[PDB]
């Protein structure tokens, strides 16, 4: 059981676990910060698969077995038109 929550600037909070496609969590001993990478399914061709937008510099929280392991800021965002 892994849950991902996102806090947006206006005050809205979303649970996006049903949309996530892949998750990665890592760290190294020569840097002070850990990193989290994830992907969601969003299609512009199909109206059904349009989702919410998550702007840069919004907080994301990562839970495993009802325990919070990661809290951080969103830094990069990318969208490919083919996929």
């Amino acid at each position: 059981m892994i849950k991902i929550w996102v806090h947006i600037k206006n005050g809205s909070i979303y649970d996006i676990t049903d949309i996530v496609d892949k998750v990665s969590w890592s760290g190294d001993y020569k840097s002070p910060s850990r990193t989290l990478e994830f992907s969601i399914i969003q299609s512009s061709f199909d109206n059904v698969f349009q989702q919410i937008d998550i702007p840069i510099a919004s907080t994301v929280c990562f839970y495993v077995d009802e325990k919070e392991l990661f809290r951080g800021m969103i830094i990069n965002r990318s969208k490919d038109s083919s996929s």
């Binding site: 020569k30 840097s31 002070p32 910060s33 990193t35 830094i75 990069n76």
Partner: peptide, 23 residues
């Protein structure tokens, strides 16, 4: 063109690591 894609990925990784801070 493979070298260009590899270089692009390496540059992106290095920039992310620079932002994160390296000892």
């Amino acid at each position: 063109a493979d070298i260009e894609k590899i270089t692009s990925k390496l540059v992106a990784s290095i920039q992310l690591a620079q932002l994160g801070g390296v000892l």
